[PDB]
């Protein structure tokens, strides 16, 4: 399982910052982004 920590605001804005480990999905909170591995 892989995870990505990125500074994001608003769920809809986590999509772009999640582009790190090559994962998908966004959803960010408290200036943190989460990526769901497939």
Domain ranges (residues) in the chain: 1-38
Coil/strand/helix, residue 36: strand
Residue 13: DSSP 8-state? G
Residues 6+ apart with CB under 8 A from 25: 14, 15, 18, 34, 35, 36
Give the sign of the dihedral formed by CA 22, CA 4, CA 7, CA 10. positive
Method: NMR
Cα separation, 31 vs 38, in Å, equals 23
């Amino acid at each position: 399982g892989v995870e990505i920590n990125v500074k994001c605001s608003g769920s809809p804005q986590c999509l772009k910052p999640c582009k790190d480990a090559g994962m998908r999905f966004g959803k960010c909170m408290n200036r943190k982004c989460h990526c769901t591995p497939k």
